[PDB]
Amino acid sequence: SNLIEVFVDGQSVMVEPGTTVLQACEKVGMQIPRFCYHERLSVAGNCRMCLVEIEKAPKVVAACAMPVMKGWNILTNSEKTKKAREGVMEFLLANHPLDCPICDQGGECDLQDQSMMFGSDRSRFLEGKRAVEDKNIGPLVKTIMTRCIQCTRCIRFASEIAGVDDLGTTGRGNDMQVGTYIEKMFMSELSGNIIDICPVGALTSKPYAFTARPWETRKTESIDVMDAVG
Amino acid sequence: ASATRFIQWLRNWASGRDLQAKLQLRYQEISKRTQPPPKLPVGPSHKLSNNYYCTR
Ligand code: SF4
Ligand code: SF4
Ligand code: FES
């Protein structure tokens, strides 16, 4: 009654038709490294990190794009899948500044956790590194666009859910700046969520700025007051 | 007497051969400030091509 039997590393799993490769892997317990995909946001194949090789295929498909059909043996720990993750990680960090001490995000950073586990130990890189002029977005959100990995997640956030339409890609190749072209002071509702949407230290809270690192502060669960929804 | 010539005969006489290898023994071949700045060699990595973590 609308269920497809497919294999993740040779293990049987039942899924609804229309679901993505990453959605099927979440059912068994697997988690493919990602940068664009979000549970609440839409689907885009920008970064091409969530590469997972399915057998009897010449090219490796992304976990974002492909919907699961009948009869697929998704191999997560094959020789080509490991080389795909190690490859793109080196491309992502070739044009990204050495800012981990001056970065507002510490242990929470998505680039840090993934590059240690999935990426290579050393980089081939010798010469390059692009530098991006920072744009003052608002007094609530500090913006250093040098660290941005042009993942296109905040642009989708402002367009589809926030519904403000200010952020956008301008330029081609290396010279691509994420943000408002007209230098407009972006202030609206849900603007304090775009700091949490961004996986890297490109967008961060200006009132918080620098106080503690993610690992240093002890987390405690509470319901927020002074709000109707709670 | 504090003269080394006569004393060296006494210490050699009283059980076992001495003369060489003193108690202090920090006179010659003790290099101060170690050496001129050296270059530390790299292992089987560092040199590019076929340096995948899939193999390692
Ligand atoms: S975004 Fe992550 S990897 Fe990049 S400088 Fe900040 S902490 Fe380091
Ligand atoms: S600012 Fe952050 S969320 Fe926006 S495109 Fe860059 S990395 Fe992605
Ligand atoms: S996370 Fe799937 S393409 Fe970027």
Parallel/antiparallel/unpaired status of strands A4-8 and A73-75: parallel
Q: Is A8 exposed, middle or buried (0-12, 13-18, 19+ CB in 10 A)?
A: buried
- Looking at chain A, which residue has its C-alpha nearest residue B45? A122
CB A155 within 8 A of CB A180: no
Residue A81, C-beta contacts closer than 8 angstroms, at least 6 positions apart = A51, A52, A53, A60, A75
- What is the number of other CB atoms lying within 10 angstroms of the CB of residue A68? 22
Residue A107, C-beta contacts closer than 8 angstroms, at least 6 positions apart = A113, A213, A214, A215
Cα–Cα distance between A145 and A142 in angstroms, integer? 10
CB A151 within 8 A of CB A98: no
| Resolution value, angstrom units | 4.1
Rg (CA), chain A: 19
**H/E run at residue A86:** helix A79-92
Residues of A in contact with B46 (CB under 8 A): 122
Please answer yes or no on whether A83 and B46 come within 8 Å at the CB atom: no
- 3 state SS for A171-195: EECCEEEEECCCCCCCCCCCCCCHH
Specify which residues A8 forms β-bridges with: A11, A74
Please answer yes or no on whether A82 and B45 come within 8 Å at the CB atom: no
Query: How many CB pairs below 8 A link A and B?
Result: 20
CA A204 to chain centre: 15
Cα–Cα distance between A21 and A71 in angstroms, integer? 12
CA distance readout (Å), A160 to A176, A178, A208: 21, 16, 27
Q: How many residues does chain B have?
A: 56
CB A118 within 8 A of CB A81: no
DSSP secondary structure string, A6-68? EEETTEEEEE-TT-BHHHHHHHHT-----SS--SSS-----S---EEEESS-SSPEETTTPBP
3-state SS, residue A117: helix
Q: How far is the CA of A152 from the centre of ligand 2 (A)?
A: 6
Identify how many contiguous H helices and E strands chain A contains and give both numbers.
5, 9
Q: Is B53 exposed, middle or buried (0-12, 13-18, 19+ CB in 10 A)?
A: middle
3-state SS, residue A95: coil
Cα–Cα distance between A38 and A75 in angstroms, integer? 22
Side chain identity, residue A83: K
Q: Does B56 touch chain A (CB under 8 A)?
A: yes
Specify which residues A12 forms β-bridges with: A7
CA angle A156, A172, A50 (to 5 degrees): 50
Residue A144, C-beta contacts closer than 8 angstroms, at least 6 positions apart = A99, A134, A201, A202, A204
- Looking at chain A, which residue has its C-alpha nearest residue B55? A79
Binding residue numbers of A for [4Fe-4S] cluster? 96, 100, 103, 109, 148, 151, 154, 198
* Max CA distance (Å), chain B: 75
- What is the number of other CB atoms lying within 10 angstroms of the CB of residue A154? 23
